[PDB]
Structure formats: structure tokens, C-alpha cells
């Protein structure tokens, strides 16, 4: 898994 979820959207 990743820790930089700030840079990504689900869809």
C-alpha cells in the first residue's frame, strides 16, 4: 500500500 494518498483519487 501507499502512504501518499494525498496525490491520488479513487476513480
Amino acid at each position, epitope marked *: 500500500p501507499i502512504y*501518499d494518498i494525498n*496525490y491520488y483519487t479513487s476513480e
Partner: antibody
Amino acid sequence: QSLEESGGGLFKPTDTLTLTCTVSGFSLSSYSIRWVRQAPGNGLEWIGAIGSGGNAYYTSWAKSRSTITRNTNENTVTLKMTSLTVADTATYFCARGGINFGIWGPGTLVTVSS
Amino acid sequence: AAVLTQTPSPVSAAVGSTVTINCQSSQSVYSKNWLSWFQQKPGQPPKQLIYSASTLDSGVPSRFSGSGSGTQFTLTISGVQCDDAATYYCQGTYGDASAFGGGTEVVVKG
């Protein structure tokens, strides 16, 4: 979980800076890596970052003369910044992103001087 | 282009008093709580004191407290000590960037 900057030292105006951030004890595929600099006696400034998927982000002044890349097999992240001026004189840090932003490298001093 | 603005520097504080450093973000930080506080002493690298707006980092003294959410954040230093003389920075993360406040220098009168 640690980071180490290398590539600092003395540069002339117009030269290219190439800093390497070498990481240990965590995977680049799970974290962002951010680049921050601090001019002598001044504030911290975010330059840019690369995400867990290898895409980079940059501040307005950096975007047009900076490239941030990585090598996941060699555990490195690279900052390349062209057209150095004396105002680029600073300590440059890499640091591991995520909500817990506590793990930084020790910093490497970049001096731009004739 | 989110910008962080903090308490103007310098803050002069008598030992044992309570210091407050305020930090305002021009846009909400990611998920409202991606906001760290950093301490830096001249000639040393910055140290994270607080992450997630209000979580104390390991080994950081109980004197420090972070609060706030969204765009408005506060660091307080309860019973400020000589060891707390330093410059403090708020640090926000957003959808496509991170940023630091300008820093607030705390000068402790002993």
C-alpha cells in the same frame, strides 16, 4: 527508515545541480519523497516531490528548470535543477512524505559562487 | 498555490509563560489534518513535533500541543523553557503539493 542526500558542494552560476536522495529501510513504491531547501538564515521551502507511482510535482518557480525522478531498484530519488544562480545557495533535504513527515535526511549544503 | 501564514516573527516569551503560534492555510489541507509542526534551532535540521495536526511525535515534551482543522491551526507551548527557543514552522500537504509557513522565531527571556 532513513534518507541520505549527496551531490552537494560548490557550483558556478549556470551549472546544473544533481542531488541524489538514497533511501534505506522502506520502499519508494509505498511513499512520496519531498525535496525541501533552506537558504542560510531563511525559511524552509518545498521544491517538489515524487509520488509512490513515480510522478513528480513542483512549485511554480521550480517547474520549468527542475526534474525529479527515481530508480526503485537502486533506492534513489534524483533532483536535477538547471541554471543555478547564487540565490540557489541552500541546504537541500529529502524527506519521506505521508501524514507522518518526521523522517528527513541530514541535508546537503549547495553553494553557488563564482 | 496554497500558502501558509503564521504568527509574525519574533515572539518574545518569558520562561514559564505560554506561547501560541497560529497558522492559517489559504486552502484546506488534505483531509483537514495533513498539517505538521516543525522545530528548528540555528545550525540544526528541522524536527517534526506534531503531525496530523494534533499528534505529538515520539519523545516530544508534553509542553507542546497542536490543535485546529482545515485552514486554521495552533501550536501552544505550555510553560515555555529555554530548550524551546527555536523557529517553528507549520507544514501543510494538499492534493498536488506541500508547503511551509514563513516560520515563527521564539526568543525565550530567562
